């Protein structure tokens, strides 16, 4: 007669431990998610930074490459005038 209420505490308290086990799982999952979201956000931020550095270096070089072909052109517009100049002196002979 009195056994039923007894089996119920047994099964009741058993559930309470399964709850504890579920909450522990849930809590441990929450940890892992936030932690995941962190590791990648920061590794990515790290790579994004390396990327920007290279892009600047590249941009600079092209600006310098701009000035260096420009410099060549000048040099040429001169070497040509000179060719013209010797051409003329040779024409005098």
């Amino acid at each position: 007669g009195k056994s039923e209420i007894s089996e119920l505490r047994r099964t009741m308290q058993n559930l309470e431990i399964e709850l504890q086990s579920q909450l522990s799982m849930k809590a441990s999952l929450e940890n892992s998610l936030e932690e995941t979201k962190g590791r990648y956000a920061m590794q990515l931020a790290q790579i994004q930074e390396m990327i920007g550095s290279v892009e600047e270096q590249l941009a600079q070089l092209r600006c310098e490459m701009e000035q260096q072909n420009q410099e060549y052109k000048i040099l040429l517009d001169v070497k040509t005038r000179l060719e013209q100049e010797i051409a003329t002196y040779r024409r005098l002979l």
């Binding site: 039923e4 209420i5 119920l8 505490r9 099964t11 009741m12 559930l15 309470e16 399964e18 709850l19 579920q22 909450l23 799982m25 849930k26 999952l29 929450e30 892992s32 998610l33 995941t36 979201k37 590791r39 990648y40 590794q43 990515l44 790579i47 994004q48 390396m50 990327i51 290279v54 892009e55 270096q57 590249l58 070089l61 092209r62 310098e64 490459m65 260096q68 072909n69 410099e71 060549y72 040099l75 040429l76 001169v78 070497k79 000179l82 060719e83 100049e85 010797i86 002196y89 040779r90 005098l92 002979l93």
Partner: protein, 95 residues
Amino acid sequence: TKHEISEMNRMIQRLRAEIDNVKKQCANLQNAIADAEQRGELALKDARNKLAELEEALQKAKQDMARLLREYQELMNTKLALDVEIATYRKLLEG
């Protein structure tokens, strides 16, 4: 007195339903993390890729410059070489 078995059971019903929800919750969670790392590994992948792509363009560019510099030097060698022809020919003129 008899009323005790009636609620212990109502409660056991409630507790299971509670546990069923933590279970249903922990499942969406794993998916979320799964989705977290799926999304993630890809961004790093993509990132890494862009990086080398540029590392590549840089070195590529580096050489092109080195080249144009040889190109300029070589153009200069001749220009200063014409400078001395102009000289030896100005001389011949004005004795």
